Amino acid sequence: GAMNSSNYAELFNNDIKLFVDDTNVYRVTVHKTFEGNVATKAINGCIFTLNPKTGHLFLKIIHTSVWAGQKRLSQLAKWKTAEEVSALVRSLPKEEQPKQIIVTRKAMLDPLEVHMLDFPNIAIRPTELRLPFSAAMSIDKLSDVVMKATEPQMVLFNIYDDWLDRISSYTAFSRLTLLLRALKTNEESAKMILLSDPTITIKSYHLWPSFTDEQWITIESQMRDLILTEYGRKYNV
Amino acid sequence: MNTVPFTSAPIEVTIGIDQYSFNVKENQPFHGIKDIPIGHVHVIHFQHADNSSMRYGYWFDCRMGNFYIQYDPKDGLYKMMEERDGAKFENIVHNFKERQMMVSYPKIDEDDTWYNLTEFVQMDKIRKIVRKDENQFSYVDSSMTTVQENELSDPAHSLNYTVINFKSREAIRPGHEMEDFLDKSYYLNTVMLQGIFKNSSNYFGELQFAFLNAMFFGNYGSSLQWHAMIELICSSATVPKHMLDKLDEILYYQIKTLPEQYSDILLNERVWNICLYSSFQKNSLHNTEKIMENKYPELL
Numbered sequence: 001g002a003m004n005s006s007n008y009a010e011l012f013n014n015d016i017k018l019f020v021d022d023t024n025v026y027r028v029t030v031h032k033t034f035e036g037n038v039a040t041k042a043i044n045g046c047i048f049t050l051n052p053k054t055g056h057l058f059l060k061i062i063h064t065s066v067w068a069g070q071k072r073l074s075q076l077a078k079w080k081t082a083e084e085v086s087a088l089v090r091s092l093p094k095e096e097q098p099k100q101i102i103v104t105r106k107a108m109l110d111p112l113e114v115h116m117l118d119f120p121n122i123a124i125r126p127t128e129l130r131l132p133f134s135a136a137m138s139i140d141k142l143s144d145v146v147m148k149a150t151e152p153q154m155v156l157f158n159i160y161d162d163w164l165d166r167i168s169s170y171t172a173f174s175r176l177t178l179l180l181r182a183l184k185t186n187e188e189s190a191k192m193i194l195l196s197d198p199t200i201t202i203k204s205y206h207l208w209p210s211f212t213d214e215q216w217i218t219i220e221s222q223m224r225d226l227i228l229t230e231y232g233r234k235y236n237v
Numbered sequence: 238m239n240t241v242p243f244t245s246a247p248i249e250v251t252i253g254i255d256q257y258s259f260n261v262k263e264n265q266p267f268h269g270i271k272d273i274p275i276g277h278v279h280v281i282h283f284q285h286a287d288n289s290s291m292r293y294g295y296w297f298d299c300r301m302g303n304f305y306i307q308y309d310p311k312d313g314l315y316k317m318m319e320e321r322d323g324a325k326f327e328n329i330v331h332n333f334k335e336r337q338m339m340v341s342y343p344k345i346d347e348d349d350t351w352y353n354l355t356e357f358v359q360m361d362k363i364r365k366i367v368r369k370d371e372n373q374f375s376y377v378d379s380s381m382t383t384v385q386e387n388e389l390s391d392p393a394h395s396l397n398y399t400v401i402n403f404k405s406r407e408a409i410r411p412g413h414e415m416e417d418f419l420d421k422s423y424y425l426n427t428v429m430l431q432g433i434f435k436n437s438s439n440y441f442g443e444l445q446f447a448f449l450n451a452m453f454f455g456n457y458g459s460s461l462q463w464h465a466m467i468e469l470i471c472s473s474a475t476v477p478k479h480m481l482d483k484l485d486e487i488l489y490y491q492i493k494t495l496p497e498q499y500s501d502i503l504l505n506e507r508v509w510n511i512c513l514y515s516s517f518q519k520n521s522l523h524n525t526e527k528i529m530e531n532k533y534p535e536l537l
């Protein structure tokens with residue numbers, strides 16, 4: 001059923017799985033009208049579909065045209081997400097389709113389950129983990145491609161860059177969730193940490209900086225300090 | 238006026254006849270039920286004094302033969318049987334009617350409760366849900382599982398209700414996933430009514446038979462079928478106006494007749510709150526909602 005800290009290691013076994021996060025599918029900018037009412041304007045969004053083992057991210061860009069003339073957008077967003085994940089599974093070769101898809105929000109279960117009726121042998125699971133995938137739009141290259149898109153588009157990334165050459169997927173996922181949690185709790189400080197030292201660059205084909213192993217330790221320590229900090233700043237401790 | 242005579246009453250039993258019941262003592266001189274209204278299906282049912290486990294009973298229509306009850310001491314229940322010799326049957330029934338060994342089906346003249354609870358139920362459809370073709374009457378008990386339940390184990394002893402599943406390909410047209418899941422009109426009107434049931438009368442009949450198996454036998458899978466058929470209508474934006482009016486009347490008498498003390502197990506909180514307050518037809522069941530609120534406000 002639900003994925004939590006007891007079966008956390010299942011994420012890195014050899015059964016193909018995908019996380020699906022829908023937080024950034026429907027995104028708006030609430031503003032005042034001339035009559036002094038309030039109105040939203042939509043902006044491009046994305047579905048965050050991630051293989052936690054390999055790091056393959058299928059970033060489906062949601063172009064604002066997909067909302068035109070539509071009612072109840074927040075509900076539509078869930079079905080839109082489900083349709084696009086389903087279209088994605090169907091595009092994949094059989095030996096590449098997931099055996100499980102884990103949704104990060106329980107409201108996605110039914111939409112996805114319905115769109116996946118053709119795939120009875122693929123389990124749709126929730127999770128109790130409070131994963132920080134909403135902060136994916138705090139990654140500059142991802143945010144950039146989303147905002148520039150002029151039509152629906154799928155863009156493939158590895159969110160681990162080359163890290164699996166040196167570390168395990170368990171450790172790569174941990175680093176990733178720590179980076180994202182930091183970006184979610186204090187984007188400014190987090191970005192300062194990552195980019196403070198001009199000599200550490202982001203390769204054209206990567207999302208994060210080229211940190212030596214020792215530098216990743218320093219960085220990881222700085223992100224944990226920031227998360228404890230903001231937790232204190234928040235709760236006063 | 239027809240009669241289900243009884244050979245004897247060797248074991249103490251609460252006997253139910255449609256919505257009535259009466260206690261018979263062990264070896265009491267009891268020989269059946271007379272004055273049973275012609276024109277409806279009926280159900281005679283049993284709950285043994287010693288072992289209240291297994292309520293069980295028979296669905297029958299007196300126009301379809303002469304039926305009686307004899308206790309079988311090997312299988313340990315009151316069995317319905319069909320006496321074929323109609324002259325022996327008049328003689329047997331007349332003997333017991335003369336000795337006043339029978340109770341009278343106690344219909345009050347103003348009382349349309351059974352007609353309203355069985356309006357669309359027909360024996361021929363009962364017999365296709367309960368498959369036992371060498372008998373004209375149909376046996377049901379507390380424990381019999383439904384075809385759908387056995388999917389999720391003896392096929393011969395199943396209730397073959399129409400399978401309804403809101404997350405199935407039958408229910409969800411390819412390319413209409415959101416539309417059909419949030420508005421089941423397609424499933425109701427095309428798949429179920431036009432496709433499977435043929436008309437709303439067959440659909441209401443099955444729904445009413447499910448409720449009665451739930452109330453009289455505590456058959457859990459029937460209660461599932463009853464609620465599922467209610468939810469499918471309530472969850473349909475587009476329902477013929479006559480079907481809606483009738484549903485309101487159908488449900489009203491089901492809720493009216495339900496024992497107050499069994500509401501905790503026979504009513505599904507989620508289905509009722511959704512049907513009365515959230516669904517498309519939230520405004521289309523005035524009588525059902527008035528009675529539910531006055532009688533079972535706790536559930537809501």
Ligand SMILES: Cc1ccc(NS(=O)(=O)CCN)cc1F
Nearest residue numbers: 242243244305320322325326329
């Ligand atoms: C109602 C009633 C009708 C028929 C029969 N039996 S028979 O003629 O003896 C046939 C017994 N198998 C018994 C009854 F009690």
